[PDB]
Amino acid sequence: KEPEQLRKLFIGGLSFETTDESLRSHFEQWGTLTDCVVMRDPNTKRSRGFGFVTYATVEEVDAAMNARPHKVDGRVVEPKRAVSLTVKKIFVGGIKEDTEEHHLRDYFEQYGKIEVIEIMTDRGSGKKRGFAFVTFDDHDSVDKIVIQKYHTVNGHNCEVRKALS
Numbered sequence: 252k253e254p255e256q257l258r259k260l261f262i263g264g265l266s267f268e269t270t271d272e273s274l275r276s277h278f279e280q281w282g283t284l285t286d287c288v289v290m291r292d293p294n295t296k297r298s299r300g301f302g303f304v305t306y307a308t309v310e311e312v313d314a315a316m317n318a319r320p321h322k323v324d325g326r327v328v329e330p331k332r333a334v335s336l337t338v339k340k341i342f343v344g345g346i347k348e349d350t351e352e353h354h355l356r357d358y359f360e361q362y363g364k365i366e367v368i369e370i371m372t373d374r375g376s377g378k379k380r381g382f383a384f385v386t387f388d389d390h391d392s393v394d395k396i397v398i399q400k401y402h403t404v405n406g407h408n409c410e411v412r413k414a415l416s
């Protein structure tokens with residue numbers, strides 16, 4: 252069984268009228284939910300406008316994220332994988348001198364739609380420095396990427412991290 256933390260989606264931007272039941276009926280369309288909670292004030296019971304859903308598998312999380320935008324009880328909500336910032340860009344290190352743009356594209360396009368690939372070169376000599384930046388159109392690509400233990404591109408074991416503004 253995959254760790255529960257990797258099967259969880261934070262759902263922001265809820266309608267205050269959304270309930271455990273209506274959040275569950277929505278997100279059960281994309282998989283089995285082992286948990287589904289709207290967060291509420293402890294005294295007033297008024298919704299705090301966010302909640303969480305937990306799927307049985309990571310593939311179900313993927314299915315739910317691929318079905319965005321989600322409109323729940325009339326409001327477009329904002330799902331994100333649980334932490335284990337929200338950015339669209341990664342640093343990729345360890346690619347040495349023989350990794351080309353197509354190696355990075357062929358691999359990373361399977362995580363999401365790529366907008367920019369920048370293979371870094373030395374400002375003086377033009378030689379490849381062995382790292383690159385990849386910008387995607389959406390943050391879930393990055394969120395999937397950084398929770399993997401390993402990344403192998405063009406036979407190299409790569410170090411990948413979020414890149415920030």
Ligand SMILES: O=c1[nH]cc(NCc2ccccc2)c(=O)[nH]1
Nearest residue numbers: 340342369371384413414415416
């Ligand atoms: O030449 C470049 N340098 C840096 C880039 N990324 C942004 C960045 C910078 C520093 C720390 C984190 C992220 C880029 O795209 N191209």
